[PDB]
DNA sequence: TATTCTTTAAAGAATAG
DNA sequence: TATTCTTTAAAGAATAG
DNA sequence: CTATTCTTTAAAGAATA
DNA sequence: CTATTCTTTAAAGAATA
């Protein structure tokens, strides 16, 4: 299980980056909104990731802070959500905005996000509310 | 998901490559028309390649530009379509000329190549030219 | 099959401990009472690996001696005991003393460590008895 | 696919040797025979490999010479034969002794070796013969 | 797939009741509290059955109402409710009383039935109230 | 496998029927314009019958006549139409309107039925093509 | 879930009996002692039943008492013990018999037994005596 | 599992034949030449059948007669040898014929029956021979 | 005509055309 | 008593005890 | 406004809380 | 001499030969 990884940014093609490493490239998928952070190719990154295993494939999926990563495996625990929507999810809100809307239950302010409905904001706050503590 | 490769090239020995990094050597399926640009062995090389996982193998190809990678990877998500066979068109026909040849629906360009057969052909216009657009 | 790794400790959480090597950062997951061994952060440290493979997850154990990765190994073979409850009898006692306590079937040295209930402990002697000869 | 490794011998207890590359060491098994033209440990050896994976567990089988890769890789792919007992018949015969007696088709030099039967040895020359040809 | 069963009542030993049509004998998982309505053995009954099927089993429920049915094949779809469970809720409360209580989101009308967790409870409602 | 049921209709809801033999009554799903034909309830009645079987679930259809089943079947083997597509199908056009407009390849006869997009119409046709000979 | 079957005896070959109702033979598996309580064939007879299913295989298992049922039900449960083996249990020792042996560990008692190990015996009373209470 | 089937023949259409028990209809695949065996349509017939389960299929097969019921559920059992091509053979030659080639070893009594090739003729004697004793 | 070789879903419920 | 958490065959046919 | 795409995938046992 | 361990695990389609 990859942890971290650091190497040489050679390309950056929203929303995948590849990063490498003692000459292996690696394709690393981000949230939209940290990938601004990445310095200029060409230069060293740094990147937490998480490493996904299914039948017919394997993906690896990156974040700038160890904050991102936890809500990350968080929220892919809750029936459906999957890694497409949970980057979603991360893109239009920050983690600790995220945190206060559940709380709160600001319905509408998961509502606005793309991809998300009604019924999917609902389950959210229902699921998620009990983690946090 | 391994996304580039960049090492010594050890043995040529068509249709495979092998390729040394730090030590480990990497066996590479690449179309038998791009072979020929492979330098001499010893030689450092650059391949972009394709990582596939099935229950029981692992298998890595290889290409010479990312226009390959990108005409093979929409080449097998078509029905009755696998590596093999997408190797085949590959060697048989330049990237571009293949989608001059879908959109004016060229039927005998298709099926005079190996292993192709009418119904291929037909199926395979169907499909496609819809995606290029 | 990943059966040592060495590298440089990067973080140390209980019960995962990080190991770089060339970039890549392992995440790797050992005994509670092996932990207080370790290397202080930053220092080169060594350990014995086993690595699981499963249907929608990889894993990689680490062991700082020889005696405990095979004890560790005989263990995950029984019936019901997973990885998880093999870490917990490994964290309460030494791989010694368990061998002692099963071979005299000392039913209550068993019992008392967490998550191991009568059955259990019945379960386990009856079948790790034949083993050791 | 892991085609070839190139690294530092660290232990070697048949049937299995351990070759660090990097800091990682892999797990390799071998034939009992060609064990003893390894190097003294510490040395550096070169090692041709064939990768198997299965649903429960991933290995790695090495070889001192591609023709003995070659006709570990045909004996699998025979019903009834597998990895195991196929190490079995290139420790007791040479690739070359074994190709003449299937064309000979001299059952008693196969039924010697262990673990092999009548009813195997049978199945063996008809599937074979007919492969090299 | 077996939409209705008509046989002779054979034995009675809650959960399950064995009826015999041309010499087989069906297993059938009943609620609990429908048992009381059952003919006394030796008579002939009616019951509304679904079918389901695992790789390792195949099981038949059974139900005296069209409308139990109904429900029943409602609350099996709701994701971690299952057979067992939903039994248990049939066995608790009426079809309509169920009904009420999720529209009117009367959390504690639900808690108080065995086997069923607030957590539970709050996801029952949320998925519910939007099919009725 | 059953291939016919005789028995007494007990219930007609479109799209189901239940059918009575010796006190089991099936469900049986049939086409929307073929329910016209069952006679009135308590009335004996004939129908064709295909089953169908799968990893959770098991159903059973029903036609009023072996045309329609031998066309249903063949439906179903194409790729991407389902059982309940193939129904559609069969409400909207007789079998013999269909063979028609395949062989003329009036595109439009096809695409004015529910829940069938332009493409699918013209996958229909390339693969049916073939078949009626 | 068939659980009784009742119907005419039309041939008795152990360990298998068909059994005739309404045209349709159904094999059924029955212990060999209780064989000897089926009447003459042509004779009607009543079984108690369990039904099996696997991926490849469906088998119908038939007992003279709902007590022997009850006893099998519980034996497979064990890991272990398939039905093949749970029908010469059955066939050496009476329910009752049984019983008495595993509350008073006659190890004895069970070894004897046709196709039963040491190793076997001992797990059976371990599993077993808990669930009588 | 049903062992045998008694009922009314509705329909004979090789290689399919349609019997009716209690207004169920049951699809009955038969071999070619047995076929002749069977009775006028109308009159009634008994059978004797095998039931096959697959994860996608259930099929039933028939016979005349106990022996040939027997040799079909042998010869299933040789890898490589499916339900259809075990019908051809019994198509093709009597039981007791089959029996004495194949002691015999007469090579050309088996490749002349169509689908069989030379390869799966030297096979099926391999495996079979030692069957019959 | 035999040969060996490949290639492997449907639904729902959200957003586009 | 509810909670969340884990853990996942049978056969054959060769060889030992 | 209707079609097209996409994407996502068990429950019971027996401990402990 | 009889028990214990182990180890291994589809077929049809439609091309081409």
Redesign the pocket.
């Given at each position: 299980v990859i942890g971290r990884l650091r190497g040489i940014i050679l390309e950056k093609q929203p929303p995948i980056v590849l990063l490498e490493t003692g000459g292996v490239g690696y394709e690393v998928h981000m949230p939209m909104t940290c990938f601004y952070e990445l310095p200029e190719a060409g230069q060293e990154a740094i990147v937490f990731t998480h490493f996904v295993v299914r039948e017919d494939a394997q993906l690896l999926y990156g974040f700038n802070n160890k904050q991102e990563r936890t809500l990350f495996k968080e929220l892919i625990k809750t029936?459906?959500?999957?890694?497409?929507?949970a980057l979603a999810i991360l893109s239009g809100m920050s983690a600790q905005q995220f945190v206060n809307a559940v709380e709160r239950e600001e319905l509408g302010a998961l509502v606005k996000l793309?991809?998300?409905?009604?019924?999917?904001a609902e389950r959210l706050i229902v699921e998620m509310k009990?983690r946090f503590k």
């Open positions: 029936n459906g959500v999957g890694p497409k929507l793309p991809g998300i409905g009604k019924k999917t009990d």
